[PDB]
Design a protein around this nucleic acid. Structure first.
Ligand SMILES: [Zn+2]
Ligand SMILES: [Zn+2]
Ligand SMILES: [Zn+2]
Ligand SMILES: [Zn+2]
Lengths: 85, 95, 86, 96
DNA sequence: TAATGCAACACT
DNA sequence: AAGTGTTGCATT
């Protein structure tokens, strides 16, 4: 129930909302949770790791604001914390 | 004036289930649908739920297929065969 | 190096030489070994189990005439020996 | 009416096809030539397609049996090529 | 609209 | 000409 989420693409059928390109079956994707006018619930808006910070997303502390952060690898967890700084 | 949330086409496969009787629809068979949100997967969500031509007309009212519209107003109807077009015209009359 | 061969389709890209239809990825297919003018060797002519006996081929004792007969589920080799005399 | 039967030209349908003139992959979309011959390592398939880069092909024009008699325009599927590609092969595979 | 199944293409 | 590997459909 957080504003953001991050994980390894469960499938390669995802699509970045920025460049409208596909996302690899294991690429690092970050989504923005938005309300759905169709059933009253949150839906993921997936972006590429680079495309995510492009649409403007100033995150102070990702470790808490982003959901599933503590599941990723330390190498990426810091690569995200750094890119967010 | 073809409807937007009501389409007709030939079963692209035999693994689609008719939501009017819950049994599979054989490939090539004519099938109808309504663009509605699937309660089990709303996150998609406004998709296609298919019915047999018979199962559809049996629920014409509940599906919101007003007596105002006809079969010819179905989306993708033009791409049907003659024996199929007229078949739906008798099953889904206008007014 | 036998005249015939039988096995479970190693892939579904095979095609019966009788009805020219595809063969399931595990269906019971029987082929006739024919000479190849390409590499000096025999080449399988796959048929459906039903299509095989249709082209008119009478096999006395399949267990020896057919290659790979002993190398398949017991349930099948009996079905082969049965429809053999028929 | 004058197009060769065992020599074709087309755009790489994928990036997983290997040029048998240098043994390296041919990137998708790239123009590629072929000869309808029987692959020695898979003779059971009979006459198929073995692909080469346009350059790797002309480098073996003689050994591949592409006589100086024929030209690039006589390639099977040549008509379905782009202009900048057609003329590109015409200079690489001249007639006589 | 993205996660399964499937089915069909591309190379050989 | 049929296995292997890959890509893209089809349904939800
Ligand atoms: Zn992107
Ligand atoms: Zn039904
Ligand atoms: Zn057959
Ligand atoms: Zn090359």
């Amino acid at each position: 129930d957080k504003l953001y989420r991050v994980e390894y693409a469960k499938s390669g059928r995802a699509s970045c909302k920025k460049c409208s390109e596909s996302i690899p079956k294991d690429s690092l994707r970050m989504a923005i949770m938005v309300q759905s006018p169709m059933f009253d619930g949150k839906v993921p808006h997936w972006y590429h790791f680079s495309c995510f910070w492009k649409v403007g997303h100033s995150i102070r502390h990702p470790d808490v604001e982003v959901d599933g952060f503590s599941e990723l690898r330390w190498d990426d967890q810091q690569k995200v914390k750094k890119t967010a700084e | 004036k073809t409807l937007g949330d009501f389409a007709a086409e030939y079963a692209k496969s035999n693994r689609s289930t008719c939501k009017g009787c819950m049994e599979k629809i054989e490939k090539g068979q004519v099938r109808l649908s309504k663009k509605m949100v699937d309660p089990e997967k709303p996150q998609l969500g406004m998709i296609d739920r298919w019915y047999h031509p018979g199962c559809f007309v049996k629920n014409r009212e509940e599906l919101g297929f007003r007596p105002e519209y006809s079969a010819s107003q179905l989306k993708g109807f033009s791409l049907l065969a003659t024996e199929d077009k007229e078949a739906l015209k008798k099953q889904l009359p206008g007014v």
